[PDB]
Ligand binder design. Sequence first.
Ligand SMILES: CN(Cc1cnc2nc(N)nc(N)c2n1)c1ccc(C(=O)N[C@@H](CCC(=O)O)C(=O)O)cc1
Ligand SMILES: CN(Cc1cnc2nc(N)nc(N)c2n1)c1ccc(C(=O)N[C@@H](CCC(=O)O)C(=O)O)cc1
Ligand SMILES: [Ca+2]
Ligand SMILES: [Cl-]
Ligand SMILES: [Cl-]
Lengths: 159, 159
Amino acid sequence: MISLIAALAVDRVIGMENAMPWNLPACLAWFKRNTLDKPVIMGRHTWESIGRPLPGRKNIILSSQPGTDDRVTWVKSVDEAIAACGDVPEIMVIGGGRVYEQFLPKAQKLYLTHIDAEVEGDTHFPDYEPDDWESVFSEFHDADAQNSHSYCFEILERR
Amino acid sequence: MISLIAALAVDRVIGMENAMPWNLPACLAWFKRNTLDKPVIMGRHTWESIGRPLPGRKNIILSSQPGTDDRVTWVKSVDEAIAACGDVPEIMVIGGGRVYEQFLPKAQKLYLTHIDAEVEGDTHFPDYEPDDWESVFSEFHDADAQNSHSYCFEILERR
Ligand SMILES: CN(Cc1cnc2nc(N)nc(N)c2n1)c1ccc(C(=O)N[C@@H](CCC(=O)O)C(=O)O)cc1
Ligand SMILES: CN(Cc1cnc2nc(N)nc(N)c2n1)c1ccc(C(=O)N[C@@H](CCC(=O)O)C(=O)O)cc1
Ligand SMILES: [Ca+2]
Ligand SMILES: [Cl-]
Ligand SMILES: [Cl-]
């Protein structure tokens, strides 16, 4: 099955021109926890943002342009991205916007981190029909000595 | 010689307890470069925000309450903090607010990272009359895919 995992600010903002204005090691831990040992599909811009291949995961980059790193797998279509995954129970799509748009229709589960940050976004998570999804887990946390904003982890399954 | 190093948002706002809303790996690299191989003195809130002893530095915590961890030095007064440093060319004071207020009078140098972020806060870096201080170095950088805001490194010497 295909799952999307994303971090959304208020109004579903997922990306800005520069790095997101937050420091959330607890949120990165949740991201690592839920992606470890699984193939991750990302767009070129997200790849460039990360800076390195994510350890212990099969990194697949969906881009029309040519591969620049021998450490990851470069694919040119959704179809191709899927095939590169092989026989695994769950494929994680980690963004950005266009990538999420292309995979949403095929997605059965969403892992969302809602952060209480009001920012002017460049890209946004595609509108999802709350009537189509069931929240099976939610957990709120305040900002603390290490995390700059309050956030809530949520997992939804398509009805 | 005593030096203070701090990261200031607009209006000289500095962290109090919760982590500051920015992601500036380039700024942390500057902090690391300037404090490695020297003793660092911090207050309890900063210690909690760091979450571990900074490697390659002698970590001293100035606090009235008992020290939990055996990996660092717990002191109860300025005098003791200083003594704990031994005889080194430069002691780095890394905050927070009360700590800065206590050492400023004795400081000979300021390493400041000014960040273009408007953050609402109670705490401010102590007032310094840059007329009693000579700006000796200043280098501005724009935000990028990895750093959330623009920042400017500045070093001042007490005249
Ligand atoms: C910019 N970016 C994209 C990013 C960030 N957080 C997200 N968070 C969620 N929930 N979903 C995403 N798709 C997501 N994507 C990044 C940047 C760094 C790391 C990262 O360093 N991850 C390490 C964990 C952090 C660490 O070791 O410092 C990992 O092993 O996953 C991950 C994603
Ligand atoms: C919360 N905090 C206090 C902090 C942060 N930036 C500052 N920046 C400046 N200029 N001045 C300070 N006093 C300052 N203090 C921190 C938190 C983490 C690390 C830290 O991880 N430092 C690693 C570098 C980054 C890394 O390895 O992840 C180091 O070796 O210094 C430092 C300071
Ligand atoms: Ca439910
Ligand atoms: Cl992307
Ligand atoms: Cl402190």
